[PDB]
Amino acid sequence: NLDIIGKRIEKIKQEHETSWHYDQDHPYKTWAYHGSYETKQTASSMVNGVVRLLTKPWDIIPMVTQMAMTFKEKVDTRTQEPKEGTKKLMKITAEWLWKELGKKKTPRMCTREEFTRKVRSNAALGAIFNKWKSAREAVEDSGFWELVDKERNLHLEGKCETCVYNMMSRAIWYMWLGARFLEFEALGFLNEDHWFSRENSLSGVEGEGLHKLGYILRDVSKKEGGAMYADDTAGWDTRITLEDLKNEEMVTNHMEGEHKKLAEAIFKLTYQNKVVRVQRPTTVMDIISRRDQRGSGQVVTYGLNTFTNMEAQLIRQMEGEGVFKSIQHLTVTEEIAVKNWLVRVGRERLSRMAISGDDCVVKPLDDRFASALTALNDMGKVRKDIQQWEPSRGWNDWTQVPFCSHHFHELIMKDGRVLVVPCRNQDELIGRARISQGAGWSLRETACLGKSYAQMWSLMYFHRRDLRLAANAICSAVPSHWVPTSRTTATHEWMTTEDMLTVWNRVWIQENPWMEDKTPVESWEEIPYLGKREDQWCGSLIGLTSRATWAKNIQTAINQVRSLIGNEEYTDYMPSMKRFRR
C-alpha cells in the first residue's frame, strides 16, 4: 500500500493543488481511490476511401458498414485468492517453466540505442505526447534521458515517482515514454530475444506468422490424443492474480547484477503496485491504485500472458491425467509426482499446445481434460460463454479450430503440393481494410495504407476469389512505386515494394519447412483458390449480381481512383488473373 505508491500520488497531488478533492460519490469498490483533479478532453475510426471505392458491393453489407461506425465494469471486479494446493501447483510449474525457457537464452538489458531505433520506425510502445510533441523528438533530447536517469536511480533505491498508468472487453494503459523505456530496458529481452518462439518454448508461436500457424496446428493434430480444445478466458487481463504476478517475477531469479535489480523494481513498483489516472465525465481525473490484474506495455503483456497461459494449461493437463487429486492441498508425495511429471513429460505436453498470449489450442492425452476444471476455475481463468462446471466442447477437425481470430484450410495445388492457409469471415477482412485510425492522412498516405491491405491479402488470403481480385484492383489503382504504410506495425512480409509473386514464392515455397519440393511458381494462375462453395461459406459474394457487375467493370473503378490520385505511374495487375488475361 501507500509507502510504495505515496511518492507517485503525492507528486500528482501537488501539480493540481488548485483542484485536489477527496470525492465522496466515487464509483470504485475494487480499486483504491485516492483523490480527483480538473481536466477536459476526448479518436474515432475514419474510412479509407481508396479501399471503399474499390469494394463497392460491400457498401450494402451491414456486417462491413457497421464496423466503421461509433466492459469497464469488468476492470472494477476482484478475483479470489487461490487455495494452497493451486498456489503450490502454480509455483512448482512456473519455477520449472522459467528454467526450460532459460536453458538456451540469456536474460539481458535492452539499450537506449535499441529503444531509439524502435521509435524511429513506429512500434506501438503506448506512450503519451506533454513536454515534447512526439516520442521521435524526446528520444533525441538529452533532458529526457536525465529524467530517465533520475527515475532509474530511484528504482535502484526501491522507490518510484513517475511510473503512472493512464487508462483509456478492452482497456489500454499508456505511460510516458520514460516509464516505457525502463520497462523495455528490464523486460524487453523476452520479445527482442524470442523467449516465446516455438523453437524455444515448444507451445509458443511468437514471430511465427499467419502462414505458419495453420501448419503448427496440423503438427499438433498428428499427436495421439482426443479432441482439440480452444477455450477462451472471459477478460484474461482482469483475471491475473497477485499470485500470477509473483510467479511471473521469478524470471528475475535467472538474472544478475544491475539487470536483476532493475527488473525486480519494474515487477515490485509498477506491476504488483499500480497507480492509474482515469477520466470521469461527472470531468475530473481519478487517481486510483490496485495490486492485481495485467497493466504493462502491450509487448511485455503478450509474453507474460503466454507464460501464465502455458502454466495454467500444463496444470489443466496434469488434472486431466490425475497427477493430483484435489486443489485444496497437495500432499508431499503429490508435489514429488508433479515435479516428476514435469521432468518426465513436461516438454512433450508443451508440444501439444499452441499459445499466443491469452489464446490457446491444446491437444491433451485424452478427453478427461474436458471436465478437468477445478484448477482452471480456482486460478480465476474462468471460460467465456459456458457454465462454470460444464465440460469443454472440443474439436475433432484441426481445420475447424479457432486460433488468433482465424481458421485454417488444407489446399492442394494443381502440382500436388499442400498449402495450409489462414482464413476468416470475409466481411471482417473487408470491414477492417476500410478503416483508418487517426487524423491528417493525405490522399497518398491513405492510398499506401490501402496497398498494405492489398499486399497482405495477396500473400495470406489469395485463396479468397473476392480478395485476390480486390487486391489486384487496389495495386492497379495506387502508383506502382508508392511504398505501403501502417501506423501500428506476426511477421509482415507484405510490407515491401518487391513484386508480391516473388514474395509469395519466398514465403510459401522457399522458406516453408513443410514444403519438400522447392520448384518456384511462375504465375498467379498456378496458385489455387478454396472450392467455390467453401469460398461462399467463408463470406464470398461470388454468385451475386452485385459481385458479377463489380468484377466485369473493375477497370472503371480502378480508373475512378487513378483520376482522384492524378497523373502518376500505374501498373495493370488485373491480367495476372485468367478472366482479365484477355
Q: 429 and 227 in contact (C-beta within 8 Å)? A: no
Instruction: Quote the CA–CA distance of 253 and 251 in Å, as a whole number.
Output: 5
Site stretch for Zn ion (CB under 5 A), options 90-98, 155-163, 191-199, 546-554? 155-163
236 assigned to a ligand binding site: yes
151 assigned to a ligand binding site: yes
- 274-280, strands of its sheet edge to edge: 32-38, 284-290, 274-280, 165-167, 173-174
Site string for Zn ion, 484-523 (x = CB under 5 A): ----------------------------------------
538 assigned to a ligand binding site: yes
Neighbouring CB atoms inside 10 A of 499's CB total 9
259 assigned to a ligand binding site: no
Q: Per rule CB under 5 A, is residue 421 in the interface with Zn ion?
A: no
Instruction: Quote the CA–CA distance of 37 and 11 in Å, as a whole number.
Output: 13
475 assigned to a ligand binding site: no
Q: Per rule CB under 5 A, is residue 362 in the interface with Zn ion?
A: no
Site stretch for Zn ion (CB under 5 A), options 56-64, 146-154, 244-252, 553-561? 146-154
235 assigned to a ligand binding site: yes
Instruction: Quote the CA–CA distance of 566 and 144 in Å, as a whole number.
Output: 43
Q: Per rule CB under 5 A, is residue 148 in the interface with Zn ion?
A: no
Report how many residues bind Zn ion under the rule CB under 5 A.
5
Torsion 392-397-398-401 (CA) sign: negative
Instruction: Quote the CA–CA distance of 423 and 409 in Å, as a whole number.
Output: 7
- List the alpha helices (DSSP H) in 61-120: 62-65, 84-102, 112-119
Binding residue for Zn ion, selected from 370, 423, 454, 469, defined by CB under 5 A: 423
Report, in Å, the least distance between residue 539 CB and Zn ion: 8
Nearest to 536 by CA among 400, 410, 427: 427
Report, in Å, the least distance between residue 388 CB and Zn ion: 32
Nearest to 275 by CA among 2, 47, 87: 2
Question: In angstroms, how far is the first alpha carbon of the chain from the final one?
Answer: 74
CA dihedral 3, 5, 10, 16 (to 10 degrees): -160
Q: Per rule CB under 5 A, is residue 276 in the interface with Zn ion?
A: no
407 assigned to a ligand binding site: yes
Binding residue for Zn ion, selected from 53, 75, 160, 454, defined by CB under 5 A: 160
363 assigned to a ligand binding site: no
> Given the complex with Zn ion, which of 157 and 568 has the nearer CB atom?
157
Q: Name the one residue in this structure whose C-alpha cell is 492489398.
A: 454
Site stretch for Zn ion (CB under 5 A), options 157-165, 274-282, 288-296, 429-437? 157-165
> Given the complex with Zn ion, which of 221 and 480 has the nearer CB atom?
221
Site stretch for Zn ion (CB under 5 A), options 151-159, 249-257, 462-470, 490-498? 151-159
Q: Per rule CB under 5 A, is residue 163 in the interface with Zn ion?
A: yes
Binding residue for Zn ion, selected from 299, 538, 558, 561, defined by CB under 5 A: 538
Burial, 351: exposed, middle or buried (Cβ in 10 Å; 0-12, 13-18, 19+)? middle
Q: 414 and 524 in contact (C-beta within 8 Å)? A: no
Task: Return residues touching Zn ion (CB under 5 A).
Answer: 151, 160, 163, 423, 538
Annotated binding residues for Mg(2+): 232-233, 358-359
Annotated binding residues for Zn(2+): 151, 155, 160, 163, 407, 409, 423, 538
Annotated binding residues: 151, 155, 160, 163, 170, 232-233, 235-237, 305, 358-359, 384, 407, 409, 423, 538
